[PDB]
Paper text:
Ras proteins are small GTPases that cycle between active GTP-bound and inactive GDP-bound states to regulate diverse cellular processes. In cancer cells, highly prevalent somatic mutations that alter amino acids 12, 13, and 61 impair intrinsic GTP hydrolysis, induce resistance to GAP stimulation, and/or increase the rate of nucleotide exchange. A germline NRAS mutation encoding a threonine-to-isoleucine substitution at codon 50 (T50I) causes Rasopathy disorders. T50 is located on the b2–b3 loop of Ras between the effector-binding switch 1 and 2 regions and was predicted to activate signal output through a non-GTPase mechanism, based on biochemical and structural studies and in silico modeling.
Author numbering: 1 to 169
The structure:
């Protein structure tokens, strides 16, 4: 069966680890070592196709590790994550998209913009802002909550759909 290599990137503390653990293990972790970068694997059914997901949950401390460049070169799709209560994390998104495009040496890279923590009442990044950004990038935008599981499957599954279309060119 097809294996899709997904990489989750974003500013520290936006919920990259919580989103992945919720997707893989169906539970909300409220504190996960922020220096730990690992890979998680899950078999899922997306649009009737059985496939395997290999997800890399990046950590900022591990960026200049020997394996980061391998997982970056091997990654087919990227989840660009920000938190809706973190204005700076949203403002940083452009750096991550630029880095991925630079490494892939490609303008068109399968990507999805994710606004995490949508369960929280305090929101400093409005949905209109993220929608405008994703539309200018030509990528989907999905609101998620690792706590309540809202949008978690949709975020990862859409990235898989983005990967499939890129393959069919
Ligand atoms: N309320 C809420 N808190 C979250 C959500 N996602 C992550 N968090 C919390 O935000 C903090 C940082 O999460 P973490 O996964 O370690 O972020 P990371 O540094 O990107 O890996 C942790 O305390 C999480 O419990 C969410 O969807 N809702
Ligand atoms: Mg983490």
């Amino acid at each position: 069966m097809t294996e899709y290599k997904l990489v989750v990137v974003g500013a520290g503390g936006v919920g990259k680890s919580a989103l992945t653990i919720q997707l893989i293990q169906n539970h909300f972790v409220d504190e996960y070592d922020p220096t730990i970068e690992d890979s998680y694997r899950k078999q899922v059914v997306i649009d009737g196709e059985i496939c395997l997901l290999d997800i890399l949950d990046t950590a900022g401390q591990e960026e200049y590790s020997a394996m980061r460049d391998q997982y970056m070169r091997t990654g087919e799709g990227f989840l660009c994550v920000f938190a809706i209560n973190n204005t700076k994390s949203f403002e940083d998104i452009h750096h991550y998209r630029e880095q991925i495009k630079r490494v892939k040496d490609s303008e068109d890279v399968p990507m999805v913009l994710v606004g995490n923590k949508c369960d929280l009442p305090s929101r400093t990044v409005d949905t209109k802002q993220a929608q405008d950004l994703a539309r200018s990038y030509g990528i989907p935008f999905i609101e998620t909550s690792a706590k309540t599981r809202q949008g978690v499957d949709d975020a990862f599954y859409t990235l898989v759909r983005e990967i499939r279309k890129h393959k069919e060119k």
